[PDB]
């Protein structure tokens, strides 16, 4: 676990409907909910390949399990029963454990993606913004929709607002 989901970020947003991970901004123009398309798309590709790897790795040949034996062949019937029960037990154990462990792999993957998004935004903003907990940043400068979109796609231009942020911070 990485501490983002059910961690320093408490709960999810029912408002964000276009993706798994994303931002919620609040400016003078208004607030919103935008999903991070790059991280969400990477997660979608990974989860799709995991599901496909689980499904398509099972290949079988045409077989018929059922067999019939007479009364004088009971060692036959018992051996057939043994092979059938053994295969069923092995497959049941394997399937249950595989699902159990892959659920933890998927949830950890989502937690890591959220934390990585948080760290990316933090490294972009540097000291131009303050961390106020809950995965939430407060800007020392004045941002419009261009600034918010710039933070979102990954082209923030810290030097543009460095001076104003310094003036507002040291006050």
């Amino acid at each position: 676990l990485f501490g983002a989901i059910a961690g320093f970020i408490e709960g999810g947003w029912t408002g964000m409907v276009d993706g798994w991970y994303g931002y919620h901004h609040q400016n003078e123009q208004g607030s919103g909910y935008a999903a991070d398309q790059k991280s969400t798309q990477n997660a979608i590709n990974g989860i799709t390949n995991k599901v496909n790897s689980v499904i398509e790795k099972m290949n079988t040949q045409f077989t018929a399990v059922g067999k019939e034996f007479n009364k004088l062949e009971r060692r036959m019937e018992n051996l057939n029963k043994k092979v059938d029960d053994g295969f069923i037990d092995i497959w049941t154990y394997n399937a249950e454990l595989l699902v159990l462990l892959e659920n933890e792999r998927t949830l950890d993957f989502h937690d890591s993606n959220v934390k990585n998004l948080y760290e990316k935004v933090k490294s972009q903003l540097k000291n131009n913004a303050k961390e106020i907990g809950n995965g939430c940043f407060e800007f020392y400068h004045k941002c419009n929709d261009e600034c918010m979109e710039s933070v979102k796609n990954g082209t923030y231009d810290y030097p543009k607002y460095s001076e104003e942020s310094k003036l507002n911070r040291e006050k």
Binding site: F62, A64, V65, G66, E68
Partner: protein
């Protein structure tokens, strides 16, 4: 008396290989073959005991 009968007919079968001969000799008590079957083996399969419509 199974099926209002007390004498019994015991049934036997064999698989004549391609290019092989079968000889029946009998001075009594033979239910002789009339119709035989030409077979080619297929994929291993089985018999399903069920009461379900066929589609």
């Amino acid at each position: 008396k199974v099926r209002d009968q007390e004498g019994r007919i015991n049934y036997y079968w064999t698989l004549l290989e391609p290019g092989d001969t079968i000889i029946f000799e009998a001075n009594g008590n033979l239910i002789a073959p009339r119709y035989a079957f030409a077979l080619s083996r297929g994929f291993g399969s089985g018999i399903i005991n069920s009461n379900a419509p066929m589609d």
